[PDB]
Write a protein that holds these residues in place. Structure first.
Motif, short mmCIF file in Angstrom:
data_model
loop_
_atom_site.label_atom_id
_atom_site.label_comp_id
_atom_site.label_asym_id
_atom_site.label_seq_id
_atom_site.Cartn_x
_atom_site.Cartn_y
_atom_site.Cartn_z
N UNK B 11 -39.17 -121.53 9.05
CA UNK B 11 -39.64 -120.89 10.27
C UNK B 11 -40.29 -121.84 11.26
N UNK B 12 -40.23 -123.16 10.99
CA UNK B 12 -40.76 -124.11 11.94
C UNK B 12 -42.23 -123.83 12.19
N UNK B 13 -42.60 -123.77 13.47
CA UNK B 13 -43.99 -123.52 13.79
C UNK B 13 -44.58 -122.25 13.20
N UNK B 14 -43.74 -121.26 12.89
CA UNK B 14 -44.19 -120.03 12.24
C UNK B 14 -44.68 -120.26 10.79
N UNK B 15 -44.32 -121.40 10.20
CA UNK B 15 -44.61 -121.69 8.76
C UNK B 15 -46.10 -121.92 8.54
N UNK B 16 -46.81 -122.26 9.62
CA UNK B 16 -48.20 -122.59 9.48
C UNK B 16 -48.43 -124.06 9.13
N UNK B 17 -47.39 -124.88 9.07
CA UNK B 17 -47.46 -126.31 8.70
C UNK B 17 -47.02 -127.16 9.87
N UNK B 18 -47.58 -128.37 10.03
CA UNK B 18 -47.06 -129.26 11.07
C UNK B 18 -45.63 -129.79 10.73
N UNK B 19 -44.89 -130.17 11.77
CA UNK B 19 -43.48 -130.65 11.58
C UNK B 19 -43.53 -132.05 10.95
N UNK B 20 -42.77 -132.22 9.87
CA UNK B 20 -42.66 -133.58 9.36
C UNK B 20 -41.68 -134.41 10.15
N UNK C 4 -40.87 -110.88 7.48
CA UNK C 4 -39.75 -111.78 7.36
C UNK C 4 -40.18 -113.24 7.67
N UNK C 5 -41.07 -113.42 8.66
CA UNK C 5 -41.61 -114.76 8.98
C UNK C 5 -42.32 -115.33 7.74
N UNK D 1 -31.40 -111.33 17.13
CA UNK D 1 -31.49 -112.56 16.30
C UNK D 1 -31.80 -113.82 17.04
N UNK D 2 -31.14 -113.92 18.23
CA UNK D 2 -31.41 -115.13 18.99
C UNK D 2 -32.86 -115.21 19.51
N UNK D 3 -33.32 -114.08 20.05
CA UNK D 3 -34.70 -113.97 20.47
C UNK D 3 -35.66 -114.26 19.31
N UNK D 4 -35.29 -113.79 18.13
CA UNK D 4 -36.20 -113.92 16.97
C UNK D 4 -36.37 -115.42 16.61
N UNK D 5 -35.31 -116.19 16.74
CA UNK D 5 -35.38 -117.59 16.47
C UNK D 5 -36.38 -118.23 17.43
N UNK D 6 -36.30 -117.91 18.73
CA UNK D 6 -37.23 -118.49 19.67
C UNK D 6 -38.70 -118.07 19.38
N UNK D 7 -38.88 -116.82 18.95
CA UNK D 7 -40.18 -116.29 18.61
C UNK D 7 -40.78 -117.07 17.42
N UNK D 8 -39.96 -117.37 16.40
CA UNK D 8 -40.42 -118.27 15.34
C UNK D 8 -40.89 -119.59 15.89
N UNK D 9 -40.02 -120.15 16.73
CA UNK D 9 -40.29 -121.49 17.29
C UNK D 9 -41.59 -121.54 18.07
N UNK D 10 -41.96 -120.38 18.62
CA UNK D 10 -43.15 -120.26 19.43
C UNK D 10 -44.41 -119.97 18.66
N UNK D 13 -45.89 -114.94 13.96
CA UNK D 13 -46.99 -113.96 13.95
C UNK D 13 -48.21 -114.41 14.74
N UNK D 14 -48.48 -115.69 14.73
CA UNK D 14 -49.66 -116.22 15.45
C UNK D 14 -49.53 -116.37 16.97
N UNK D 15 -48.34 -116.11 17.49
CA UNK D 15 -48.05 -116.39 18.88
C UNK D 15 -48.62 -115.41 19.97
N UNK D 16 -49.13 -114.27 19.54
CA UNK D 16 -49.59 -113.26 20.46
C UNK D 16 -48.53 -112.30 20.96
N UNK D 17 -47.30 -112.48 20.48
CA UNK D 17 -46.23 -111.60 20.88
C UNK D 17 -45.63 -111.02 19.58
N UNK D 18 -45.00 -109.84 19.68
CA UNK D 18 -44.39 -109.16 18.51
C UNK D 18 -43.02 -109.75 18.18
N UNK D 19 -42.62 -109.58 16.91
CA UNK D 19 -41.31 -110.06 16.56
C UNK D 19 -40.18 -109.31 17.26
#
Lengths: 22, 22, 22, 22, 22, 22
Positions: B11-20, C4-5, D1-10, D13-19
């Motif tokens: 999950x990248x940034x969602x993982x809670x870990x910094x990127x290696x 899921x995250x 799905x595509x939106x969800x990938x960007x939401x992970x990247x952002x 859960x910690x981002x302030x926006x819903x999945x």
């Protein structure tokens, strides 16, 4: 970075190719 | 590259870990 | 979606838990 | 799905926006 | 790395933007 | 959920494939 995207697309480690720097 | 791949998979940034870097 | 995250963060399939719907 | 990938990247859960659904 | 994850999510090579360093 | 995980691992929208639902 674009090579690295393609490497992901191809399965990443399971592609059997080295992770590229680009 | 390998380590980064796994981080992305997790999950990248969602993982809670910094990127290696690898 | 948030479950899921967390499941991704925990290793996804290798977590040994079902992929959640949320 | 595509939106969800960007939401992970952002930050997911910690981002302030819903999945997203997509 | 974090930026790079979002760049993937946005379409990567096809997105019209270059791959990020972070 | 499983299929989606792999899609993400492969760069999500960068993979050139639509997101699966599982």
């Amino acid at each position: 970075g674009d090579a690295y995207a393609q490497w992901l697309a191809d399965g990443g480690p399971s592609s059997g190719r080295p992770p590229p720097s680009g």
